[PDB]
Amino acid sequence: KIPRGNGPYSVGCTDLMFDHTNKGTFLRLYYPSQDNDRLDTLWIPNKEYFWGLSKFLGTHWLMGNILRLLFGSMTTPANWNSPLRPGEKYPLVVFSHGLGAFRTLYSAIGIDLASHGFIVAAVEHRDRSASATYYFKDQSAAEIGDKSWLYLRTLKQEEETHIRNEQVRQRAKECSQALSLILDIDHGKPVKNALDLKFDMEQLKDSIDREKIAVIGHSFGGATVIQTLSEDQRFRCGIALDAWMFPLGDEVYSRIPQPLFFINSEYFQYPANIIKMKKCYSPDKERKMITIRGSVHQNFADFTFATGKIIGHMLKLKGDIDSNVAIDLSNKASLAFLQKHLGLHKDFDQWDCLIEGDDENLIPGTNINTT
Ligand SMILES: CC1(C)CC(=O)N(CCOc2ccc(F)c(C#N)c2)C1
Ligand SMILES: [Cl-]
Numbered sequence: 001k002i003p004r005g006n007g008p009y010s011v012g013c014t015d016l017m018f019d020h021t022n023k024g025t026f027l028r029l030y031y032p033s034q035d036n037d038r039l040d041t042l043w044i045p046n047k048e049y050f051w052g053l054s055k056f057l058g059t060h061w062l063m064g065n066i067l068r069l070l071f072g073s074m075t076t077p078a079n080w081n082s083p084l085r086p087g088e089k090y091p092l093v094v095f096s097h098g099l100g101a102f103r104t105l106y107s108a109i110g111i112d113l114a115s116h117g118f119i120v121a122a123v124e125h126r127d128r129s130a131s132a133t134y135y136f137k138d139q140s141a142a143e144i145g146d147k148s149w150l151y152l153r154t155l156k157q158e159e160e161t162h163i164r165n166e167q168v169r170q171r172a173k174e175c176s177q178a179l180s181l182i183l184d185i186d187h188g189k190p191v192k193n194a195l196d197l198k199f200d201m202e203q204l205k206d207s208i209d210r211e212k213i214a215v216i217g218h219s220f221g222g223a224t225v226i227q228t229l230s231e232d233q234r235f236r237c238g239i240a241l242d243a244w245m246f247p248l249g250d251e252v253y254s255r256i257p258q259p260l261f262f263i264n265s266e267y268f269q270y271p272a273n274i275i276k277m278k279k280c281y282s283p284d285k286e287r288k289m290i291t292i293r294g295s296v297h298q299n300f301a302d303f304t305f306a307t308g309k310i311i312g313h314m315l316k317l318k319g320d321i322d323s324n325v326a327i328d329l330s331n332k333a334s335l336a337f338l339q340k341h342l343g344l345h346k347d348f349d350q351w352d353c354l355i356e357g358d359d360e361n362l363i364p365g366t367n368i369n370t371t
């Protein structure tokens with residue numbers, strides 16, 4: 001089971017696609033909810049995501065069918081289409097998923113954030129870095145629900161540098177676009193959700209704390225944080241979760257004025273990557289780095305909760321550290337950082353010491369030597 005949020009607020013979930021096209025925004029929203037008696041949220045909502053995952057793993061599509069059998073009824077503890085908790089303006093996080101992932105696979109993070117009074121928009125990227133995603137060819141297709149699917153692009157070695165950079169720039173634009181959509185809904189612009197879901201978007205009117213915006217993401221999503229910050233000053237700070245730095249252009253490193261927090265796994269990182277993170281540092285800029293002891297790259301994503309301890313460790317979905325312990329640290333340290341750099345008036349400064357890696361399961365900075 002994917003853990004429930006640790007915060008005081010109940011959590012709701014829904015999906016927004018606007019416009020309906022491959023250039024529209026697709027996101028999963030996690031938000032403080034008024035009610036706590038709704039059905040839980042289906043974790044991986046369509047069979048095609050499992051086919052996507054099968055291609056990402058480099059297996060036959062029939063492994064996709066097997067993955068569906070195993071995981072296709074799994075839920076995540078968020079009240080599907082629950083009304084938004086009224087009477088308060090919430091800060092906003094835009095969240096960016098990893099390569100071969102998609103919008104629904106970081107619910108442990110999204111739910112926890114929402115339970116502390118954030119609205120979280122987990123974008124689904126259309127750069128062919130998602131295992132799968134979908135949209136509609138035209139207005140007619142959107143009405144009848146005739147989905148067009150877009151699957152993960154496999155690269156040749158000679159395409160890697162160039163295409164990963166094209167992808168990270170698209171990802172950043174998608175983050176900025178998702179922000180604009182949410183800010184426009186906040187004002188009260190009518191938006192007809194291309195998905196026919198019983199969550200009225202007008203609830204979001206006057207519900208966003210409009211200057212309190214952050215961008216967070218895992219791996220490819222971590223590079224996306226960085227690209228996004230350099231190009232969109234509306235994002236006040238960023239948190240990169242085990243960032244994969246390879247996609248970034250040489251130009252971006254000196255171009256990130258906002259506070260930036262690197263939260264790393266012990267076992268993912270390597271000198272080339274760490275060197276790139278250190279290129280983000282300058283005397284006038286606020287940077288923080290911590291490393292979670294005993295953790296692996298997948299501790300930041302939901303599949304760390306989806307299997308047992310023995311299978312999970314074999315598949316590199318789990319580390320030596322307990323998955324809930326690990327995500328608690330990442331999520332609490334994130335909260336403290338956000339409160340600091342968004343100027344929130346909550347109690348998240350109780351976790352300030354985690355920003356400095358002061359905890360028995362944290363390493364300050366990095367375990368990686370780069371000399
Ligand atoms: C360094 C990379 C190749 C680049 C990158 O982004 N990486 C993270 C991928 O993270 C995934 C993928 C698929 C999933 F289903 C889940 C989950 N849950 C997580 C590895
Ligand atoms: Cl790893």
Ligand SMILES: [Cl-]
Nearest residue numbers: 270271272273
């Ligand atoms: Cl290296």
